[PDB]
Amino acid sequence: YNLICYFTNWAQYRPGLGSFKPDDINPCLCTHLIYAFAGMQNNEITTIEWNDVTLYKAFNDLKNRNSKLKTLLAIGGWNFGTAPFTTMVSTSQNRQTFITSVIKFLRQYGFDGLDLDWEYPGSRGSPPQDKHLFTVLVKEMREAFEQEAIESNRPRLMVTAAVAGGISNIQAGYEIPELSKYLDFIHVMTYDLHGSWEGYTGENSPLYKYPTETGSNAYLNVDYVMNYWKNNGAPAEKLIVGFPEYGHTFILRNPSDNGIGAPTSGDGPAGPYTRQAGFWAYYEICTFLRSGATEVWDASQEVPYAYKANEWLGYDNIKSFSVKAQWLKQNNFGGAMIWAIDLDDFTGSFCDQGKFPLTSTLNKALGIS
Ligand SMILES: CC(=O)N[C@@H]1[C@@H](O)[C@H](O[C@@H]2O[C@H](CO)[C@@H](O)[C@H](O)[C@H]2NC(C)=O)[C@@H](CO)O[C@H]1O
Ligand SMILES: CC(=O)N[C@@H]1[C@@H](O)[C@H](O[C@@H]2O[C@H](CO)[C@@H](O)[C@H](O)[C@H]2NC(C)=O)[C@@H](CO)O[C@H]1O
Ligand SMILES: [Mg+2]
């Protein structure tokens, strides 16, 4: 099994104990580390932070402590949008220019591959032709990587992609049978399945549907999403299950109505380190649990939730990570990916569960070390 761990280049700016840079990573936890994010300019891959070159070096220097580790650079992300991707894939010339820039950039800075994080082909302004042109881009990139390996006598660069977990986005975005032939791994974003945007409480990454859900609400679970990818053409061994090391928060409209599906208002509370309404890192969750919160096991969905007065949290813990890890092995998936290692209790100072408790749980369950 593989354990793919995302690192984010803005975690460095969090205050105090939240500040996280590549030297905070334990290099033996994961099989692959992915650096989020690179950008694009003039159809070529580029940096986005003033000190990315420094952080790239610290990141790829982690391979000096773990000889089996591979690193990848992710391009895109949510806030990147779709416009640069649409322009880049629109012509063979623009695609060859991008691919050429990627080979040079990855080799120069010491990366072993590229993770495509276009959110999403065919959605968010991307026109319908981008579904097929994404396949063309990946096929051409895979072919170019194969040839560069022969020419340079080095192991081939990997091409992977982070892909939608929402069914409407999947249907608009991906030619799954053909795309799956050329990708090395498919990182399915089986999280953000519920959140304050819905107006009621729900779990960030429930394994199974809630018993009362019918129709399109029943898409919103790990089991459905992973099996959608598998049964529409993706090989199980290339499919990587997304594991969030964070939870989504809500403000309850009536604190006495605090179950799954209880009505909510607004964007949800923010945490002192991540400072974004609706989102708490696992280490911030541990502080909440120590602040008088009630913890509940959502038995049908195999995940926890917790509440305190008007605040409600849907999240993941060691138990739910363990259940889902057993599940993915039983379904013959390729492994797990975590968003994001800088949201784990990397200092060990918040959760009393050791350093990197969630990532360590997957390391152990998947036999990585
Ligand atoms: C591989 C992956 O999950 N990519 C997406 C991420 O971009 C997104 O994280 C968000 O990234 C923004 C930049 O694109 C950051 O500004 C923001 O802080 C961060 N949000 C959260 C909730 O972490 C993750 C989140 O699951 O999912 C994808 O959408
Ligand atoms: C299954 C699905 O498609 N869920 C969607 C959510 O992803 C989305 O939330 C946003 O997800 C981004 C990663 O893809 C994050 O970067 C972003 O922070 C997050 N928005 C939040 C937390 O408010 C929601 C709302 O846009 O839509 C769902 O359909
Ligand atoms: Mg009640």
Author numbering: 22 to 390
Share the article's original sentences:
One of these proteins, Acidic Mammalian Chitinase (AMCase), is an enzyme known for its ability to function under acidic conditions in the stomach but is also active in tissues with more neutral pHs, such as the lung. Mutations Lys78Gln, Asp82Gly, and Lys160Gln result in the loss of surface-stabilizing salt bridges in hAMCase and may contribute to its reduced activity at more acidic pH. It is likely that the dual pH optima of mAMCase is intrinsic to the catalytic mechanism, where Glu140 can be protonated directly from solution (at low pH) or through proton shuttling across the catalytic triad (at neutral pH).
We also directly observed conformational and chemical features of mAMCase between pH 4.74 to 5.60 by solving X-ray crystal structures of mAMCase in complex with oligomeric GlcNAcn across this range. While modeling chito-oligomers into strong electron density, we observed strong positive difference density between sugar-binding subsites near the C2 N-acetyl and the C6’ alcohol moieties. During ligand refinement, we observed density for both the α- and β−1,4-linked GlcNAc2 anomers in the active site. By modeling GlcNAc2 as sequentially overlapping ligands in alternative conformations, we are able to visualize each step in the proposed catalytic cycle of mAMCase. When the −1 subsite is at least 50% occupied, Asp138 prefers the active conformation (up towards Glu140).
